């Protein structure tokens, strides 16, 4: 019901209160800023979520490499430090059952199954298209999903709340980082409980929004 | 049946053997070893440090030297343990000067004595080490995945000071590393699946 207006656009959302701050902090400024230029929520392509859907992952800023106004400043400047506000809203009726785990994995090293070969460039950075979990039970990094709750996360249940809002500050060892090289965070939606319905197969869309709030840029060129 | 020790400082800090090597020495008529002193080799310390993302600590290196027998008796050798920091190129023309350059820190110790103990400070460009690095090495655009050029401590180089000694004894060197002043950030899930390779996170299952 409550609309969240940031910049020149906005998206109808559920009431936003007591939103999750990752590790109990918010993306403050480093002790020009894009509160206008690149501000508004960038809505990615809605993924079709079915009963046999393993999951999806979008690294930050992998899905944002070229998006709208933000796609220009990626290759334009030398360094940046940016926070992220991620709002994942999944619309469904009261007759659908299931659960979706939206968790942000800082510093996610992916992996492969039953081989020692390291993934290539196209396998790691997929751009806006995003990837699909090969084995979501092991998270693809070799760890376990049961203890994966240690990260910041929110629960989307078709009973209680159909949306989630996660705020990610700047997490890095360096004050700034390289746009096309290192991925600080990772956005993952994990369907712990699959879909179920009266019909054999249904389709539940998922909307994902990411706002690069309170960031900076240096090294002007081009 | 029926918080002091639970602290992270006491949890991550323990004495473990990160390098085990013994070079065969009988008759040469060379002898040395160098290694990157990384925590991904020893399996118990790896998973011990896979729990956390970024780590800040000062490595404390202790070299223990034992001499075996392949009654003569054990002579006392003089050994030199030199630490080579990252950025020093190694064009090895052995028998001549690189080891003895005054830039690199070296230490001399005998066989019978308290074990040589040195404390390596924190050397990094960034604020802390990166155990999990999502990205590629440098900017090669296809550069190596999973290895961050920003964090490399260096190579630990150890050789015997004395010349060839006519014995058939094998020298065994043990290097223990106990970190101190440990600061932790971003705890992660443990990895139950075995380690296929130390170069990346691939799992078998």
């Amino acid at each position: 019901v409550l609309q969240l207006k940031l910049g020149n656009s906005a998206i109808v959302t559920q009431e936003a209160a007591n939103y999750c701050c990752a590790y109990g902090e918010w993306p403050n400024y480093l002790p020009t800023q894009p509160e206008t230029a690149t501000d508004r929520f960038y809505t990615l392509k809605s993924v079709k979520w079915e009963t046999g859907s393993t999951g999806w992952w979008w690294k930050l800023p992998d899905a944002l490499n070229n998006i709208g106004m933000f796609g220009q400043n990626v290759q334009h400047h030398y360094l940046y430090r940016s926070g992220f506000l991620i709002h994942v809203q999944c619309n469904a009726t009261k007759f659908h059952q299931g659960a979706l785990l939206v968790v942000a994995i800082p510093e996610h090293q992916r992996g492969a199954h039953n081989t020692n070969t390291s993934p290539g460039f196209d396998d790691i950075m997929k751009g806006e298209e995003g990837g699909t979990f090969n084995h979501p039970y092991v998270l693809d990094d070799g760890t376990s999903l049961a203890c994966a709750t240690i990260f910041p996360h929110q629960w989307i249940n078709l009973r209680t709340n159909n949306s989630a809002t996660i705020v990610l500050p700047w997490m890095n060892a360096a004050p700034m980082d390289f746009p096309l090289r290192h991925n600080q965070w990772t956005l993952a939606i994990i369907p712990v409980v699959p879909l179920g319905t009266r019909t054999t197969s249904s389709m539940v869309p998922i909307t994902v929004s990411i706002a690069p709030m309170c960031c900076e840029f240096n090294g002007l060129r081009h | 049946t029926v918080v002091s020790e639970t602290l992270v400082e006491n949890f991550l800090s323990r004495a473990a053997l990160v390098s085990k090597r013994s070079f065969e020495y009988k008759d040469h008529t060379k002898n040395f070893f160098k290694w990157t002193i990384n925590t991904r080799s020893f399996v118990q310390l790896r998973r011990k440090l896979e729990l956390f993302t970024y780590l800040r600590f000062d490595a404390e290196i202790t070299i223990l030297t034992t001499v075996a027998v392949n009654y003569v008796g054990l002579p006392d050798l003089t050994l030199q343990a030199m630490f080579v920091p990252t950025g020093a190129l190694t064009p090895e023309k052995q028998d001549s000067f690189h080891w003895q350059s005054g830039s690199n820190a070296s230490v001399f110790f005998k066989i019978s004595d308290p074990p040589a103990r040195i404390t390596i400070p924190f050397m990094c460009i960034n604020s802390a080490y990166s155990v999990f690095y999502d990205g590629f090495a440098g900017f090669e655009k296809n550069g190596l995945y999973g290895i961050n050029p920003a964090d490399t401590i260096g190579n630990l180089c150890v050789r015997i000071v004395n010349e060839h000694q006519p014995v058939g004894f094998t020298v065994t060197v043990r290097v223990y590393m106990k970190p101190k002043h440990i600061k932790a950030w971003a705890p992660r899930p443990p990895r139950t699946l075995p380690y296929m390779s130390i170069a990346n996170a691939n799992y078998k299952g």
Partner: antibody
Amino acid sequence: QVQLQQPGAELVMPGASVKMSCKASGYTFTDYWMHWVKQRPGQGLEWIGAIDTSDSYTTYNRKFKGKATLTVDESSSTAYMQLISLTSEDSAVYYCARGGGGNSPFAYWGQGTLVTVSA
Amino acid sequence: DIQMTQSPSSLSASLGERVSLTCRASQDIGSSLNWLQQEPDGTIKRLIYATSSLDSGVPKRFSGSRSGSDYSLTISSLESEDFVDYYCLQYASFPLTFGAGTKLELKR
């Protein structure tokens, strides 16, 4: 006991592209990777891509991206290769390898196919 | 893609006269490398994998060593059937690439 079989030639004109069969025997097909290697008459070895048997996860080269399509079948324990819009430029001898957990090696190879296209 | 430089591209040797082929990589692939034998009939067969390790059933004349900046394939004794196309491959990371190759010739 264990071998690989990819017999035949199958020359074809442009407008459609033939799809490879790679069949394996002697080992459990579900637990091992499947690779592909392209031998060009110009002595090119250029590698095509790899596919997982369990999942549909694949990896493609930059220059070969959007062309090659990999699919496998665990029922018949075979492997398929699907191309699109082959022209008079592409001709080569196709190979399919296995790999594994360790070394992901090339140890087992096929006989090879003769692909010659003309306008 | 990471390129594997194989040199020399050709050589001429007689029976015996052990000769090693050296490959160089712009990036560090670790201990993971493979060598492949290519017969004139079109059948490829593996020879050397993971440096010192060798294939079961292949005679001991094939060997390898590493100076740490390079990868070498050493053959103790050559033969009349030992004329093939050798290639060095890196399976450590995707994508997998092939070397330049060397065509062995006989002095006549």
